[PDB]
Amino acid sequence: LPIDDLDLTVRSYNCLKREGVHTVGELVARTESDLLDIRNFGQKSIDEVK
DNA sequence: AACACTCGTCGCCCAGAGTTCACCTTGGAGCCAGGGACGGTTCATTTGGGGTGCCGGAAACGGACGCGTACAGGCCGTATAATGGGAGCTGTCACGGATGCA
Predict the structure, then answer these.
(1) Within 7 Å: CB of A14 and strand B?
(2) Whose CA is closest to A21, among A10, A12, A8?
(3) Which residue, A9, A24, A28, A42, has fewest beta-carbon neighbours within 10 Å?
(4) Which candidate, A23, A3, A1, A5, places its Cα nearest to that of A13?
């Protein structure tokens, strides 16, 4: 499933589509620590992803 | 061994990336209405053409028909005198019985 299908807000889509994350399969493959590593990552994005 | 200087690190503070959320337009995509000319169809010619069955007959042609020639096979005759075969090579044994003689 793509991350857009999760019907989320501005920042998470922006910071994901620049770097080529297209699905939630790679997102569930990546752990919370491996996804929070990104510079200027929103804590609200962390909350919604968790 | 005693003494007086300059550099990451972090937080914090303001501006937009660019994204979402969310407002007006206008070229529509199509839907329908109307008008050819057009190509498909059909039907009048149209006499240009294919057509032909048979023949006078001319000439080939297939064969009959009669009459010559050709070797193949057959018949026939040869007048000094010429008057009874070469050849075969045979080392069996058993043995039953006829068999020409006993």
Answers:
(1) yes
(2) A12
(3) A28
(4) A3
Between the two ends of chain A, the Cα-to-Cα distance in Å is 16
Neighbours of A42 (CB within 10 A): 16
Q: Which nucleotide is nearest to A9 (CA to C1')?
A: B20
For A34, the enclosing helix (H) or strand (E) is helix A32-36
Measure A20 CA to B13 C1' (Å): 32
Asked whether A49 and A35 are in contact (CB, 8 A), the reply is yes
